[PDB]
């Protein structure tokens, strides 16, 4: 019924990282369209255009709901649509998350990543991914991704994490500077 | 008054339901709440999860005790009726704190300071949950107008109202202000209700 | 003194190579060195890359270029008043030759002139290997960057990144440990070239 | 025409490279284009080639070589002149170009060439600009369609004769497509040290 917090303002979509995955917002669709100026729409119709301009096999949808936009929409695409719901209470995604994100991109082509604004749990499966199946260190990784997608995994306890598991958690960077749509604020209406 | 305004996009906020109603009085002197929500939200709030602004002067009432003054220190008015508040005979006052994250400026304590100093009776103060611009305002004033010093003013909202101020840029400023920057905590322990997820 | 202006060949392996990267970490802006208009006639229109192309780019992005840093060895590609004329400051750092790494001594004289700053471009002849080589010293030495995260941050703004293999270990001799060196990438479709044309 | 004595650089990546590779199966002998006196301004005397030098090592292993294939397109290197004086026969083949591999038609027209030197005839010389790529290539065609061989030894035979042989992935690749299994095609060997341009030069 309404849109997210700090969506409206968050950037659309990354470059693809390593040619493999795109990271991105979620969409929303035209039943969001007089909570959202034109200038700031992100229908899944917008996605299968810069598409049109590689073909993107597989979307990842990290987020907790169906009504942000019409799975439909994206599949009449010819892309396979997957939801892959992770841990919450904040945790980072548990080991049967992504080793599930590991074997669902095994099967192949672009795959399109999201949770809400595209940056934690979209980075952190994507670096994981990276380390694990194609030996990536987890250092060129949170890079990569950061480089593609800034500031890229800014949540410091998922930074810590990917350092625990595949490199050494001494050397996790610290969170990145944060741009102006990036804010954390309880009272902002 | 957007309390009586339609009700169409008007959930409530995240996080408040398993959010404490409010915290013990600081140093007898400042009672530390959430924000009310009044009954127009009742149909997304569980009876047990209720907290209209009858149940606030209802406790007043069993404290024993007045409350001279509520300041409300969230961006809109669409959360109670603030004449709930003023019937009871408690002045009500919006202090609006600067956005985007940050510590409350200067010029917001100053203003706080000023107007609470003109106030045995309580002062209520809340923002949307009762923890950061809340525990701020209510350090700096035992800070600068009751020469407490910061650690104390700190470990008293956080006992008061635990965990108190949780927000570790807050902490960190209210040292670099009142002490020592290097001596501040870390943000401490988070209860369960209390957590960060773009996707809950 | 500026050899534009004076009666050559463009570079061999130069004419698909891409034009520029992406801004690296928001600091710089990794190019090919760019050919004047009197090249035109040895250049069809969809490949040429005027300096004049480079600040339309930077006017298109709303956002300075304080500085341009040349690495090649010559002055007869472009005129580099060209660049200095849109306020962009111009120096030329000549690096050791002969296949050499850029040497310490070149790191830190790179380093010296960014500090005094907006994008900083940076090109070589073709804008990859001495240009990553740099970009990733400053962030490691500058930013404390691991060197893994820069050769790797320089391989996704400007794919693949550095690609002799020397420099990529000689990089991991200096700022890490030389056995953690990432193998050289395949070498890019736009080095082809036919030995009998 | 014969633009060798008309107007001017000498081939890149050329100073370095190996002059000729072993003879493969007593029949072909691989190398790089010569380059004439007219060069020899451009380049160090310890690094010259000259068409009398093959000559020379030919008279050092007291064996004829019948026919001297050129994959180049030019005529200026070196006077084919002083090839055919020596009693050797000489031939153009022009390949297809823009980074193509040998056509069945330049096969075709390469086998037919040399099938004559066991017909009527030896060493058949075999040379484009470097004397691996088109060299190797046509060779390798040569052993399978003619002489029976396996794909794997003939590209073998070649990286043995001719170090590290044929070093162009598509090459190989192509090879294998027509004479075995394209799975079984050798990755490319790394690029020979002669081969190193620095950019900036």
Not at 56 to 69: A, I, K, P, Q
Not at 110 to 129: D, K, P, Q
Request: aromatic share 12%.
């Amino acid at each position: 019924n309404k849109i997210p917090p700090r969506w409206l303002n968050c950037p659309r979509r990354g470059q693809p990282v390593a040619g493999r995955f795109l990271p991105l917002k979620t969409m929303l669709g035209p039943r969001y369209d007089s909570q959202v100026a034109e200038e700031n729409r992100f229908h899944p119709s917008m996605l299968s255009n810069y598409l049109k301009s590689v073909k993107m096999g597989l979307l990842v949808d990290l987020t907790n709901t169906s009504r942000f936009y019409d799975r439909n929409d994206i599949e009449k695409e010819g892309i396979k649509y997957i939801k892959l719901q992770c841990k919450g209470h904040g945790e980072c995604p548990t080991t049967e998350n992504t080793e599930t994100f590991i074997r669902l991109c095994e099967r192949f082509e672009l795959i399109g990543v999201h949770c809400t604004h595209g940056f934690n749990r979209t980075g952190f499966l994507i670096c994981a991914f990276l380390v694990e199946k194609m030996d990536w260190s987890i250092e060129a990784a949170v890079a990569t991704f950061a480089q593609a997608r800034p500031p890229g995994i800014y949540k410091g306890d998922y930074l810590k994490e990917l350092f625990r598991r595949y490199g050494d958690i001494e050397e996790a960077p610290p969170p990145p500077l944060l741009p102006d749509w990036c804010f954390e604020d309880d009272e902002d209406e």
